[PDB]
Amino acid sequence: SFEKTPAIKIVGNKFFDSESGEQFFIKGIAYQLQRSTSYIDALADPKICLRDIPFLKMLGVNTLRVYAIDPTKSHDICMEALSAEGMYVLLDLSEPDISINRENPSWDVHIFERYKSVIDAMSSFPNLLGYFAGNEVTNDHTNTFASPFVKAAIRDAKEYISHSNHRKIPVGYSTNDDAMTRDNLARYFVCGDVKADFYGINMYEWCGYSTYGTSGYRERTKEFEGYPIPVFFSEFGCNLVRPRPFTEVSALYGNKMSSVWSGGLAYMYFEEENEYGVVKINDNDGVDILPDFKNLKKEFAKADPKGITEEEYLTVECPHIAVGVWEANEKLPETPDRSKCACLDEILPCEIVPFGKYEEYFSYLCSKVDCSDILANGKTGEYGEFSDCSVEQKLSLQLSKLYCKIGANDRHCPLNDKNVYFNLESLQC
Ligand SMILES: OC[C@H]1O[C@@H](O[C@@H]2[C@@H](O)[C@H](O[C@@H]3[C@@H](O)[C@H](n4cc(CCC[n+]5ccccc5)nn4)O[C@H](CO)[C@H]3O)O[C@H](CO)[C@H]2O)[C@H](O)[C@@H](O)[C@@H]1O
């Protein structure tokens, strides 16, 4: 049963409860456990989530941000338990080992399959608020060319959801707060023919007992006034001054900011040797409440954002390219084609299995054959025909091209490595 969490929908630049029609404001906290899979999925483990939900209820949150789930595991126990307390989930589609790499960006079948798997695992829950298609991918002026790959991911996640039987859960983006790139990033993700459905900023400008004017919150609010999609703080809670008073919460849900922002999520629930937690899990797996907890609790309790209803509410150019400043082309890479890339597994004479060596093997093979067909350039908007295939498929293509160039036809692939093998399926889309 999900009566207490009706699905939230987007109209214009605001969230709305689909039943009542009241504006939905996010009063949230990040909820994600680490190790000392690589990620831990707290929503796949009832003993973890059912321990914490009572404490989350005390905080008075209506939303969690979760950065990683294991899509092979069940989540209905934790998601229904969250729904029981009126709590929604914002969920990143990526994870640390399967993300768009800001140092070498690609939008490919491997990353897209990860996104699909999370979508298929989590879309049945009415309290799934939205998906993030990326988190701080571009983070400064040196990697703005990663952003077209994220926009392609937004488009393709939205289309995948559209073509599924699922509820059309919105797909957005979470960005950092770098001064040189923030205005261009915000414009880029709503420009042209592809748009993020919502926009989260990881916002740490307000530290200690600051103010609306002095923190920078006033300038941010004036910048995002009239922004065409919902905007919120996907993270907040600068910890320079402790215990964190969380006085930004009073500003965030006040009348000046509540007209522009759709709330935000504190970072975070768990303490992980970083002084960002509101609780600490002890050696007996029990929850010890930390000094920040009471301050966030009081601030959320006092917050009462005056929104507008759905019915009364009902009544862009991409940034130009400039070298060293903004290098994200409007032209996006194509939708990764699993069938095309899977046909390389069939027909290619020389293949390499996944298991440092990528840099060496690409450097070696791309000096002997033309690797243009696997390159992807977000600056120039030039995307090779097989640039959407997996790193292994890309490598295999180049090895196979070298094999055909030599033309011995003796089943000896021209790269001595144990991961290399001659594909017997090639001899038989
Ligand atoms: O796509 C961009 C990059 O994504 C990386 O993975 C991603 C990963 O780094 C990210 O990690 C977040 C991490 O960004 C977030 N976090 C918050 C903070 C506090 C920052 C404090 N602070 C204070 C003041 C100013 C600025 C900052 N520190 N870390 O904490 C989350 C839960 O603890 C954690 O999961 O989570 C994503 C989703 O799962 C992965 O997609 C990949 O590993 C990189 O290869 C890739 O380049």
UniProtKB/Swiss-Prot annotation:
Q: Which GO terms describe its cellular component?
A: cytoplasm; fungal-type cell wall; fungal-type vacuole; plasma membrane; side of membrane
Record EC number: 2.4.1.-
Q: Where are the transmembrane segments?
A: none
Q: Name one GO molecular function term.
A: 1,3-beta-glucanosyltransferase activity
Q: Subcellular location, in the record's words? A: Cell membrane
Q: List the disulfide bonds.
A: C49-C78, C191-C318, C207-C238, C341-C389, C343-C429, C350-C413, C366-C371
Q: Where do the catalytic residues lie?
A: E136 (proton donor), E235 (nucleophile)
The record gives the membrane topology as:
Lipid-anchor; GPI-anchor
Question: EC top class, in one word?
Answer: transferase
Keywords on record: Cell membrane, Cell wall biogenesis/degradation, Disulfide bond, Glycoprotein, GPI-anchor, Lipoprotein, Membrane, Signal, Transferase
Main location per UniProt?
A: membrane
Q: Which residues bind (1,3-beta-D-glucosyl)n 1?
A: Y67, S94, E95, P96, D97, I98, S99, I100, N101, R102, N135, Y267
Q: Name one GO biological process term.
A: ascospore wall assembly
Provide the effect of Y67 to F/Q: Slightly reduces catalytic activity
Q: Where does (1,3-beta-D-glucosyl)n 2 bind?
A: E136, D177, R182
Modification note: N-glycosylated.
Which family does the record claim for this protein? Belongs to the glycosyl hydrolase 72 family.
Could you tell me what this protein is called? 1,3-beta-glucanosyltransferase GAS2
Q: Which organism is it from?
A: Saccharomyces cerevisiae (strain ATCC 204508 / S288c)
Instruction: Give the shown range, full length included.
Output: 29 to 489 of 555
